[PDB]
Design a protein around this ligand. Structure first.
Ligand SMILES: [Mn+2]
Ligand SMILES: [Mn+2]
Lengths: 189, 189
């Protein structure tokens, strides 16, 4: 009749949830995502660094139920562009999400279906409300891993497809040790 | 047109979310909740301590949306019984909840509508999954404030009344400076 309640441990310093489902994304998994494709290729052949890892505790896709996951987003740049998660829209556009920043320095880039953009800086303790209808990506703007916990409806779904093709209308770069949020040159949509 | 995304800061050491709606619950707000009623009256009339504070960031009661709140559960006892939150079932039964422990030592007592209870220990970094259909209450079993963040569907609602009259089937006590989960001596059914 009833699902079993349970506890798991999250290590706030490493992001690891022991016995969660671990996904690893290396740079080679992100062709077409970064603006500087020649820088992408070089770094892929040279080293192919891990860009991010995810530790996810997911339920069966059910309305009213919740999933949670940590992400460890590693520091680095592709050309001038900081490492980031691929980003997605939810499959059901009526699903919100909550992020809680745990370690390091980063931010969230969000985008409406039109291309209207929003940046929210994230340091430890920051809680971000991700509303329905917004595509979302996190960005590591520091020198150490950026670690966060996300809590999201079990039936939210993921649409990675649109972002893979279009990308975000903004990019986050470093020029001169200054972090800048600027127009995506490759934005024609 | 769109709901605005936003970030708020949570201070992990205090539980404070500046810009949240703050709620304070004192012992006098919890008449009939504790087993030792004489100890309850004496403490109300001698001190009326703060039992817990909540900082809540809530949305409209809409499908797919999410609320979040921190709670600061203060240390203490009423007779042998540790300080706890009032507890509730959700008013919509099939709505789950995720709790993240941040500071101190505590735990969650959960119970089905059939009266079967479960206890999950919570130390900093513990994430607790509260499934649909379970009433839930947090308990501070240490000498420091127990601080946690909860994320819950915006339309889960609350049913406080049921617990107000019944209580939980188990209580959490100190006997020999040792934490025990024992039967609620008032439990008939
Ligand atoms: Mn998401
Ligand atoms: Mn609840």
């Amino acid at each position: 009749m009833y699902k079993e309640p349970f506890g798991v441990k999250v290590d706030f310093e490493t992001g690891i949830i022991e016995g969660a489902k671990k996904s690893v994304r290396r740079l080679s998994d992100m062709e077409g995502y970064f603006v500087d494709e020649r820088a992408w290729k070089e770094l892929v052949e040279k080293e192919d660094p891990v860009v991010y890892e995810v530790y996810a505790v997911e339920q069966e896709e059910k309305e009213g139920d919740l999933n949670f996951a940590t992400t460890v987003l590693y520091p680095g740049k592709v050309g001038k562009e900081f490492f980031f998660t691929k980003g997605h829209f939810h499959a059901k556009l009526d699903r919100a999400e909550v992020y809680v920043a745990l370690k390091g320095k980063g931010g969230m880039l969000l985008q409406t279906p039109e291309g209207d953009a929003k940046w929210i800086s994230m340091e430890p303790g920051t809680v971000v409300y991700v509303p329905a209808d917004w595509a979302h990506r996190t960005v590591n703007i520091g020198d150490e891993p950026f670690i966060f916990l996300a809590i999201y409806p079990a039936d939210a779904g993921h649409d990675y497809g649109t972002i893979a093709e279009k990308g975000f209308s903004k990019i986050v770069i470093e020029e001169n040790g200054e972090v800048k949020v600027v127009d995506n040159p490759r934005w024609k949509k």
